[PDB]
Amino acid sequence: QGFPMKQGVLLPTRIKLLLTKNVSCYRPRRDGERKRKSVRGAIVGPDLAVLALVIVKK
RNA sequence: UAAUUCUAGAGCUAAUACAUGCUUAAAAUCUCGACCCUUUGGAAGAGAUGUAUUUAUUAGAUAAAAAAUCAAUGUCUUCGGAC
C-alpha cells in the first residue's frame, strides 16, 4: 500500500498510532501538534514490497 | 503507493540550536581549636560566609520626671569600680 515499517510494534500488520515530535515516520507542520497516522508493523511477511539490506560482512 | 503539504534505508558538515565547564581586589566576622602555663589567660592553624529555592526563630523602638539597689565593666583610676 505504501506504508513504512516501525521498529517496536510486534505485529505483522498495520495499525494507527498518535505520532509525536522526535519520532520517525512523521514530520510536524506547526509546533506542538500531533497527528494520528497509520504505520506498518515490525515483522516481515508476504505482504511487503521492498526491504532494506546492509552488508555487515561480505 | 491509484493516490494528499505521505515519506523509508545508506552517506556527509555548522550555531545565539543541544550538552558541559575555568577565571578575580582587599577587608572584616564567626565558629572549631595545636600548643602555652597560667592567671581573671592567650593562641597557631583550620573552615564558613554571592544570589535563588523551603522551614523555624529574633530586630523591625517611641506619650513625662528622680532614687535605693545586684554586680560587671568604657574610662581620670579616685583599683572605690561611682561613672
Phi-psi region at A28: left, alpha or beta (left = phi > 0; alpha = psi -120 to 50) = beta
Evaluate the CA torsion angle A10, A16, A21, A24 in order and state its sign.
Answer: positive
Query: What is the Cα–Cα distance from A58 to A48, expressed in whole angstroms?
Result: 25
List the beta bridge partners of residue A14: A40
In this complex, the answer to whether residue A26 has its CB under 7 A from any atom of chain B, a nucleic strand, is: yes
Task: Check if residue A34 sits with its Cβ under 7 angstroms from strand B.
Answer: no
**From which experimental method does this structure derive?**
cryo-EM
Asked whether strand B has any atom less than 7 Å from the CB of A20, the reply is: no
Question: Which of A11, A58, A57, A14 has its CA nearest to residue A39?
Answer: A14
- Provide, in whole angstroms, the distance separating residue A55's CA from nucleotide B3's C1': 34
Distance CA A11, CA A40 (A): 8
A21 CA from B78 C1′ (Å):
92
A39 CB neighbour count, 10 Å cutoff: 19
C-alpha cell read off for A7 = 521498529
Residue from A45, A54, A40 nearest A4 by CA: A40
Resolution in A: 3.7
* A14-18/A36-40 β-pairing: antiparallel
Cα–Cα dist A58/A21, whole Å: 37
